[PDB]
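Why predict the complex rather than its parts? Because the way molecules touch one another can change local conformation, and only a joint prediction can capture that. The input here totals 339 residues.
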Amino acid sequence: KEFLAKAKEDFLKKWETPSQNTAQLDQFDRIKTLGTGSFGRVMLVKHKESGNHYAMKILDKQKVVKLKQIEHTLNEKRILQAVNFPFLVKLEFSFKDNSNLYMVMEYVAGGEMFSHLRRIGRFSEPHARFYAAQIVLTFEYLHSLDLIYRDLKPENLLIDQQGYIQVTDFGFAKRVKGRTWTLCGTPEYLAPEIILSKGYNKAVDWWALGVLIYEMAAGYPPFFADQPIQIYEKIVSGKVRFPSHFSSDLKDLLRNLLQVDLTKRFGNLKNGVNDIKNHKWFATTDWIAIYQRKVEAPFIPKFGDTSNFDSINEKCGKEFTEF
Amino acid sequence: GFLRSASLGRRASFHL
Ligand SMILES: Nc1ncnc2c1ncn2[C@@H]1O[C@H](COP(=O)(O)OP(=O)(O)NP(=O)(O)O)[C@@H](O)[C@H]1O
Ligand SMILES: [Mg+2]
Ligand SMILES: [Mg+2]
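Output of the joint prediction:
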């Protein structure tokens, strides 16, 4: 637990002092944008100094106050500036303006895994094991800090130019030591304890992991239907039909990950994360090399190239004084 | 018993 205690200490220290106003909008120059949302815009910018390319989000204070989404926008920045993991997108610069927010994070070139997965159709089980192993370490790091992710999906997994994972979206993130109740996520990745309106803890991410692995190896999510209300019935039913080409080790790992019983699910038992790390499916996985990122990636994207993607008066300023 | 393309498109996140 040497790395575990070092991470928690440096996290809780950074958590109490959340840095801000550490750069200037004018310093970066505007480059072609990457995407937009209901609350703001996601862009790629270049710093005049050696910083150069950077991915930055510009959020409007009107948007987060209008739909009461302000609860998740304050958690997002604070969690980002305090974590330090290879598979998490590094937050570099953070500052506020009279009308906009600024989270300068690393630009990831390879694009969303959802794109590559849909192109290829399916990932080979070795290809899936490489991506899944990074998430397991990413969850163990976030669960030792009492954080839950609550939005695991291929559309939120970015591939860097070295073929590795960079988890991007932290909106629905929050640290809980017990349970929470907020309905957030994607219907095809919601855990049963979320749909039933019962309380849910850190075990929802280990459910989402089983869905993510299923979608990588099969090419489609395990629960799907015309109407979202049918998806909820399928999720709580506990009946999953595995594809033929699935291995015996993979089908066994998914039944434990996609367990409706919250206390018979891997990552929630007494052993914890090593329940999954020491599974017959992850036998070929060297976890120390994955963390240190010294493993040949099974796929490196084609490669700043954006080739893989497709009033001035202060308003509500005191509402974001912490930011 | 189909694999409809609407179930295979990009998926957004909701909040309530
Ligand atoms: N660091 C980054 N590097 C490269 N692309 C990024 C980065 N962060 C976000 N994007 C892209 O910017 C777009 C915004 O996605 P996201 O970061 O999830 O914000 P969002 O509000 O959830 N928009 P959406 O994902 O479409 O619902 C997506 O196309 C992402 O792939
Ligand atoms: Mg997303
Ligand atoms: Mg989204």
